[PDB]
């Protein structure tokens, strides 16, 4: 209820097929603006900002509550409950792909389908597991985020976008710079702490894992790992371009994959 307002919840479009757009680290719901008109004809679209988004009042951020991704799942569920939507497809980027996986396990009745973009179950390497990151690597990043947040944000943006698409760099920079630096580091620590490998078989929803040709946070082998471990019917749909933010850098191509993934659920 207060959440509806606090997280800037908007419902646009129309249809018996409800879809939730749940954005990732460093953006807010506006990151979906380019793909949104491809879904508005056929679906009722629910959009919201994560409590850590720069567009949400940062004094809402309770540092103890959001120690864990469960608390973000709480909000998502409270949002859906407030709207009396008893079933939906969910599209999650980055940290929201993790949020959607947890939410779909807590409420399988609610999530008829997942679509996972820039998704990983764990970023740290492990004996037989290639996450893409070692402990020293992340720690260097946490240390830069505190030392000089704006320099870190300026160096991270182009790498997240991956392809040379200056409009996407600038737009990802604007939301990145809009995050309160202490919140931003907090979320980044939470995410890099998270390990969903064990609960992947608990997801019952069909799922589409969207793979780009390169992702600074998601090595090539992670998608085939998700496909082999998610417990519902899972496919990996491929974009012919690179980057961690395709909804900013290749929105037309992403819109193709979204229309197809959201056809039947
Ligand atoms: C992928 C990644 C490296 C960056 O500096 O922070 C991150 O989340």
Summarize the structure in short.
By secondary structure, this protein is an alpha/beta fold. It has helices spanning about 1-5, 70-85, 95-105, 135-145, 150-160, 165-180, 180-195, 220-230, 245-250, 250-260; strands at about 10-15, 20, 45-50, 90-95, 110-115, 205-210, 235-240.
Report on this model:
With 265 residues, this protein is of the alpha/beta class. The protein has a single domain, classed as Alpha/Beta hydrolase fold, catalytic domain (Rossmann fold), CATH 3.40.50. Helix content is 40%, strand content 14%. Strands 1-3-2-4-5-6-7 form a 7-stranded mixed β-sheet, with helices on both faces. β4, α3 and β5 form a beta-alpha-beta unit. α4 crosses α5, α4 runs antiparallel to α7 and α5 packs antiparallel against α6. The chain is globular. The relative contact order is 0.17. Bound molecules: (5R)-5-hydroxy-3-methylfuran-2(5H)-one (H3M). (5R)-5-hydroxy-3-methylfuran-2(5H)-one (H3M) binds next to loops. This is Strigolactone esterase D14.
- Helix tally equals 10
* Strand coverage percent: 5-15%
Fraction of helical residues: 40-55%
The number of distinct structural domains comes to 1
Basic shape: globular
Q: Structural class per helix/strand content?
A: alpha/beta
Widest sheet, order of strands? 1-3-2-4-5-6-7
Ligand roster: (5R)-5-hydroxy-3-methylfuran-2(5H)-one
Within the CATH hierarchy, at the fold level, what is the topology? Answer: Rossmann fold
Q: Main sheet?
A: 7 strands, mixed
From the coordinates shown, what is the CATH architecture?
3-Layer(aba) Sandwich
N-end to C-end Cα span: 28 Å
Using only C-alpha atoms, the radius of gyration works out to 17 Å
According to DSSP, the number of beta strands is 7
Q: State the CATH superfamily name.
A: Alpha/Beta hydrolase fold, catalytic domain
Name the CATH class: Alpha Beta
PDB class: hydrolase
Keywords: alpha/beta-hydrolase fold, hydrolase
Assembly: monomeric
Entry title: Crystal structure of OSD14 in complex with hydroxy D-ring
